[PDB]
Amino acid sequence: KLPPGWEKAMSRSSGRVYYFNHITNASQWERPSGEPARVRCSHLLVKHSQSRRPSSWRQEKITRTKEEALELINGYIQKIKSGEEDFESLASQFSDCSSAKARGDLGAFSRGQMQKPFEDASFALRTGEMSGPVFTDSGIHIILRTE
Ligand SMILES: C[C@H](O)c1nc2ccccc2[nH]1
């Protein structure tokens, strides 16, 4: 009996159980703690060549592959989790969304407004929690639920 979307798994490298959320792609060692009309989220977007618009304020022509975008996302998540970098800092510097200029903040939103995988992950995140890689037609997202 775990919160929405969580399941038990076993580490291949360590053998210790961990928890994975199939809506948010979050993964963690600790057992998860546990819906509002609106949530507030920030995100860091890494676009790729198959993004709906392969262009951003960082790059007129985004040419990186989906796999390359995912590896960038993976490295940002690693540095956020290690404390080496802050989400807001990486979003401001590297997000391919115009919300980079607001440290990735998108403001508050309801169901029905965002692309569905983004929405589902946002609403399955607890306040303060961060997603793993979330895939949409825009690219690949790291989502931070702030409210
Ligand atoms: C103080 C902060 O937690 C932090 N985490 C780090 C990870 C790698 C290198 C430097 C780092 N500084």
Query: What is the 3 state secondary structure string of the chain?
Result: CCCCCEEEEECCCCCCEEEEECCCCCEECCCCCCCCCEEEEEEEEECCCCCCCCCECCECCCCCCHHHHHHHHHHHHHHHHHCCCCHHHHHHHHCCCHHHHHCCEEEEEECCCCCHHHHHHHHHCCCCCECCCEEECCEEEEEEECC
C-beta of residue 8 within 8 angstroms of C-beta of residue 102: no
Out of 42, 51, 95, 97, the active site residue is 97
Domain identity same for 53 and 119:
yes
The reply to whether 93 and 48 lie within a common domain is yes
CATH code, domain carrying 7:
2.20.70.10
Q: Is 82 near ligand 1, meaning CB less than 6 Å away?
A: yes
92 is catalytic: no
Same domain (yes/no): 67, 11? no
State if residue 83 touches ligand 1 by the CB under 6 angstroms criterion: yes
Is residue 27 domain-shared with residue 66, that is, in the same domain? no
Are residues 73 and 6 part of one domain?
no
Domain count across the chain: 2
Give the range of the structural domain holding residue 24, as residue numbers without chain letter.
Answer: 1-32
Same domain, 47 and 104: yes
Residue 82 CA to ligand 1 center (angstroms) comes to 6
* Residues 20, 87 within the same domain: no
Given in angstroms, what resolution was this structure solved at? 1.6
CATH number at residue 52: 3.10.50.40
Method: X-ray
